[PDB]
């Protein structure tokens, strides 16, 4: 009885066990939730013959 | 090769060289016509690996020593422009890589801190429960440390 | 008079793409870990240049550019039919000749205007307009992909 | 009178595909741990454009 009750109390107070993959996913989700930084007017081309 | 075949490189080289400055007339239209005429004086013939023919460049000038010196200077100019462009691209890639590495290091640090905090909380709860149940025996179970955090209280 | 001008473009560099390159690299790295579909896909530069080329030769882009060019607005008689015919003619004025990699020729765009300075200024403005539209479209695509990835990660 | 008009279309992008893209990607992710599919499969937008 004492050890079983202590096991129940400890597992109740600790909570579910999460592996490293869950923590890595949470960390990545934080940066994803930060949101992308959008900047316009960046060129998508380079000139080989400038118009004249 | 891309720098060699580009119109802009030829235009800038002809504008920079002394072969063209001495031939300026002072009239904008005449100068533009002369520059455009001397642009076509440099022809790039691409090479084919199948026929074992390499890339070649032909320059045309009024005098043979000029026809040699100008070609040498133009090739050097194209090489310099290509080197500068390659250096700029390398610097940009380096900046992108270091930004990515910094982000990855930050993420790893956050993960480590989260795991440490979870273990600290588990330690505190186990201490409280062990105090409550007065299990002061240091040795309680055969398995050594690295026990699962669930039944972690089985310690003095 | 029908003065003409020609421009030749190629893929941009890492340094001129700005932060979009880093964001797309981050998304591709995420795609590498889960939903493996890289298969040495074309780099970000190729995608950006493909979008720019697509926006360069599109009829809609030419029409929208001419509608605001401030050079078409001066030649508006006030009749709807005449304005539409002139707009169609000027849209047909701008031409795009795709390049072939086998013959080492690049993509070129040719514009035809009424005066010599207008054959240059209008071409520069049109290229800038197409680049801006391509950049906006790429930003929208990046936002959509980011939202989809965030939703997937939340579900996981 | 026989008047005529012309239109030119191309493949859509992720943004205009709406929520269907996420569902299809989820199903594809479920379909790469079972009944192996080709890694270089045509993308969702390509299939949608082919159907269109």
Numbering used by the authors:
A (entry chain A): 261 to 312
B (entry chain H): 105 to 260
C (entry chain A): 53 to 208
D (entry chain F): 53 to 104
Copied sentences from the primary study:
Lipopolysaccharides such as the enterobacterial common antigen are important components of the enterobacterial cell envelope that act as a protective barrier against the environment and are often polymerized by the inner membrane bound Wzy-dependent pathway. The alternating up-down nature of these essential loops, located at the top of the periplasmic bell, are modulated by clashing helical faces between adjacent protomers that flank the L4 loops around the octameric periplasmic bell. This alternating arrangement and a highly negatively charged binding face create a dynamic environment in which the polysaccharide chain is extended, and suggest a ratchet-type mechanism for polysaccharide elongation.
An overall resolution of 3.4 Å was obtained without the application of symmetry and, although clearly octameric in nature, displayed a loss of octameric symmetry in the region of the L4 loops at the top of the periplasmic bell. In this region the L4 loops are seen in two conformations, one up and one down with, remarkably, the subunits clearly alternating between the up and down conformations around the octameric complex. Although the application of C8 symmetry did marginally improve the overall resolution of the map to 3.1 Å, the alternating nature of the L4 region was averaged out. Thus, in order to resolve this alternating arrangement of loops, C4 symmetry was applied by using two adjacent subunits encompassing the two L4 conformations as the asymmetric unit resulting in a 3.2 Å map. The high quality of the C4 symmetrized map allowed the complete amino acid sequence of the periplasmic domain to be built, including the dynamic L4 loops in alternating conformations. Within WzzE, this alternating arrangement of the L4 loops results in a subtle rearrangement of its two flanking helices (α6 and α7): when in the upward facing position α6 helix is tilted approximated 9° outwards away from α7, and is slightly elongated suggesting that a slight unraveling occurs when L4 is in the downward position; and when the L4 loop is in the downward position α7 tilts slightly inwards towards the center of the periplasmic bell. Thus, as a consequence of the up-down nature of the L4 loops the full octameric structure of WzzE contains a 13 Å opening at the top of its periplasmic bell nearly double the distance compared to that of WzzB containing all downward L4 loops at 7.5 Å at their narrowest points.
